[PDB]
Amino acid sequence: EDLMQYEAMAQDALRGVVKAALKKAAAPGGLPEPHHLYITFKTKAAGVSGPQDLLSKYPDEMTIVLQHQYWDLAPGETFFSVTLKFGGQPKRLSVPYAALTRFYDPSVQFALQFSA
Amino acid sequence: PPEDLMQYEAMAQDALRGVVKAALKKAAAPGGLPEPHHLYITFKTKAAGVSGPQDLLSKYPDEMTIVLQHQYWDLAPGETFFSVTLKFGGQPKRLSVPYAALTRFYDPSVQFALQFSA
Numbered sequence: 001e002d003l004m005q006y007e008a009m010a011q012d013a014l015r016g017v018v019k020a021a022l023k024k025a026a027a028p029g030g031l032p033e034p035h036h037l038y039i040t041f042k043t044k045a046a047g048v049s050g051p052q053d054l055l056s057k058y059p060d061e062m063t064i065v066l067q068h069q070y071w072d073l074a075p076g077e078t079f080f081s082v083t084l085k086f087g088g089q090p091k092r093l094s095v096p097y098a099a100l101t102r103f104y105d106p107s108v109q110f111a112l113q114f115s116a
Numbered sequence: 117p118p119e120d121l122m123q124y125e126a127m128a129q130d131a132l133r134g135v136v137k138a139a140l141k142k143a144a145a146p147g148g149l150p151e152p153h154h155l156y157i158t159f160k161t162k163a164a165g166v167s168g169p170q171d172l173l174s175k176y177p178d179e180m181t182i183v184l185q186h187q188y189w190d191l192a193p194g195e196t197f198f199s200v201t202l203k204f205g206g207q208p209k210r211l212s213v214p215y216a217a218l219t220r221f222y223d224p225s226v227q228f229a230l231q232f233s234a
Contacts, residue, residue: 003150006228009138016131021122032121108120 022075036067045099140193158220165214
């Protein structure tokens with residue numbers, strides 16, 4: 001076995017792909033068609049925040065999608081915030097890259113699983 | 117799709133630089149790396165941020181490789197760069213390299229290699 005645990009360090013490091021993608025999504029032009037993103041995170045992880053009413057319906061994991069219906073994406077180095085609609089209702093979420101568990105871009109079938 | 121407009125391979129490749137940062141933090145701990153893990157780190161000598169003994173650097177104004185095994189100390193894997201003292205021909209010297217200057221990383225013990233864009 002590997003006492004260095006590279007497979008695990010590589011996995012945690014790859015969380016940075018999500019950060020870079022959102023950086024592109026927030027720059028002029030947004031995501032290049034037809035790219036869109038599935039992001040899954042632990043609802044109760046430290047730092048995630050949003051409406052209690054919404055988060056309560058998602059006990060542990062929640063998946064959001066960035067395609068067209070999203071506003072004010074703010075991707076920082078530790079967490080990102082974005083506005084999405086739920087039941088047609090706009091709601092603000094902030095989730096740390098550390099709380100992520102999955103990343104998927106259907107366009108090119110790019111996938112990333114995280115420990116979290 | 118004839119093309120990935122998001123360039124995930126490039127962003128992934130760049131994000132893995134964090135593997136090196138994570139490895140150096142384990143090495144900076146008392147007890148260092150678990151035997152027989154030794155690390156080869158290659159960086160671009162002229163990239164911004166790179167600093168050390170001019171004489172030494174000048175010996176290779178291109179890509180230089182340093183190995184971290186036993187004779188290294190005061191390794192500081194900061195946020196955007198790391199500083200470390202190594203012995204070149206016996207004389208200890210400080211090296212400062214930004215993670216963005218890394219062009220390669222390699223640990224023979226488990227055959228784990230990574231290469232990054234110049």
